[PDB]
Amino acid sequence: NNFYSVEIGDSTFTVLKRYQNLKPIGSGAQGIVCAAYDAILERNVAIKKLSRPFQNQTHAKRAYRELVLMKCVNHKNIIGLLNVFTPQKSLEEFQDVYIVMELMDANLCQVIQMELDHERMSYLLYQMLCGIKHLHSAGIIHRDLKPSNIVVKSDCTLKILDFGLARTTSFMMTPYVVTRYYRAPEVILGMGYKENVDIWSVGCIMGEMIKGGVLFPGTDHIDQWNKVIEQLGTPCPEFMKKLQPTVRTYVENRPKYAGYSFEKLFPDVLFPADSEHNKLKASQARDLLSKMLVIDASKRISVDEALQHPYINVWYDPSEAEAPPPKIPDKQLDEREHTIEEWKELIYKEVMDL
Numbered sequence: 001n002n003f004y005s006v007e008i009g010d011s012t013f014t015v016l017k018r019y020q021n022l023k024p025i026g027s028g029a030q031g032i033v034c035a036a037y038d039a040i041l042e043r044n045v046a047i048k049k050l051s052r053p054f055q056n057q058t059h060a061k062r063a064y065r066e067l068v069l070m071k072c073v074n075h076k077n078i079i080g081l082l083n084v085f086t087p088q089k090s091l092e093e094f095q096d097v098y099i100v101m102e103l104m105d106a107n108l109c110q111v112i113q114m115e116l117d118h119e120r121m122s123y124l125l126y127q128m129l130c131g132i133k134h135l136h137s138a139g140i141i142h143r144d145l146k147p148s149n150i151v152v153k154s155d156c157t158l159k160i161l162d163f164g165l166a167r168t169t170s171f172m173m174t175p176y177v178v179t180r181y182y183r184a185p186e187v188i189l190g191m192g193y194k195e196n197v198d199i200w201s202v203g204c205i206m207g208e209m210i211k212g213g214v215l216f217p218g219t220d221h222i223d224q225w226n227k228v229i230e231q232l233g234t235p236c237p238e239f240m241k242k243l244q245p246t247v248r249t250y251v252e253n254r255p256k257y258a259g260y261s262f263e264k265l266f267p268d269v270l271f272p273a274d275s276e277h278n279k280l281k282a283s284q285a286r287d288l289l290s291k292m293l294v295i296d297a298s299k300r301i302s303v304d305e306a307l308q309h310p311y312i313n314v315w316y317d318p319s320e321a322e323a324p325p326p327k328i329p330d331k332q333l334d335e336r337e338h339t340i341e342e343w344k345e346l347i348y349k350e351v352m353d354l
């Protein structure tokens with residue numbers, strides 16, 4: 001009727017006719033999304049088909065939180081929801097949900113592959129921090145920030161795709177994805193998390209841009225942990241005291257590593273080196289990496305302090321950072337699970353009232 005369908009993109013995508021030339025743009029995301037052009041809105045847009053949101057309890061919780069949060073967040077550095085629709089009209093036969101958002105040219109991983117410069121690097125970091133701080137203002141901690149989770153346009157405008165892992169992780173159900181390369185020590189040591197955990201992830205991403213590869217490539221759960229202390233160094237006594245005993249021992253037992261200094265971990269050679277300023281801005285970068293890639297989260301830099309750091313403060317504009325806090329509509333119980341049929345009705349009602 002007012003919907004048209006295409007089998008291109010490996011499934012029968014049904015969409016309004018305003019979106020046309022649907023083409024696959026999937027390259028690793030937990031979702032198969034396709035690119036499109038809207039006639040009503042001049043801009044080309046990207047559309048996602050959510051396969052069986054109510055298929056299990058885990059799928060629904062991810063979809064329900066994404067839809068409610070995307071609808072109630074307005075930030076330049078966080079992806080926004082243009083329109084949500086479902087081809088089916090009946091709740092009883094309701095099976096699929098489509099999401100349209102501002103199309104971006106590539107993910108941060110692809111942009112990392114191209115060697116960049118301090119001005120573009122500082123700008124990507126500045127935006128990532130503003131998105132995280134905007135999330136923290138509403139009480140949201142991501143803990144799953146990765147370069148495949150970050151999307152960029154050709155003008156270097158950065159946006160964040162997903163809203164992380166909600167409340168809780170090294171072994172998660174099929175809806176979610178487990179990426180350890182950028183996880184903090186606390187999440188890998190069960191210590192507990194506060195808002196500065198996301199600061200650790202950006203430090204691994206920032207270092208990855210400079211180094212050109214994953215900072216801590218761990219084949220498994222605990223090889224990840226060995227890589228962190230192998231280069232950053234063995235933790236100090238006050239930190240290992242508070243860990244629960246079954247894991248405190250593994251820490252005290254593993255071979256002690258002095259750890260390399262950031263100066264040799266991130267030497268000037270890879271950085272731009274002809275300019276003194278380029279070397280100086282490198283000096284501003286290495287200290288920032290020293291202040292966020294800290295195992296004791298209590299002594300790790302805060303999101304607010306990172307924004308006013310010399311490497312990041314040049315771009316400080318209150319519109320991006322000091323934006324009005326986001327308020328979530330039916331979040332009071334956003335920490336609770338329910339029946340699949342009840343799960344099914346709520347997602348339909350969140351899409352059917354827009």
Ligand SMILES: *[C@H]1[C@H](C(=O)Nc2cccc(C(=O)Nc3ccc(Nc4nccc(-c5cccnc5)n4)c(C)c3)c2)C(=O)CC[C@@]1(C)C(=O)OC
Nearest residue numbers: 025027028029031033046103104105106107109147148151
């Ligand atoms: C990074 C890297 C890798 O495989 N990435 C990669 C390789 C090839 C192609 C693409 C790609 O298509 N990127 C791409 C294209 C278009 C868009 N646009 C877009 N706009 C809005 C929304 C979405 C979207 C939403 C949900 C789900 N998907 C997309 N897309 C985007 C965002 C991206 C990417 C490697 O080869 C190494 C592996 C990897 C993944 C890495 O991180 O290694 C550390």
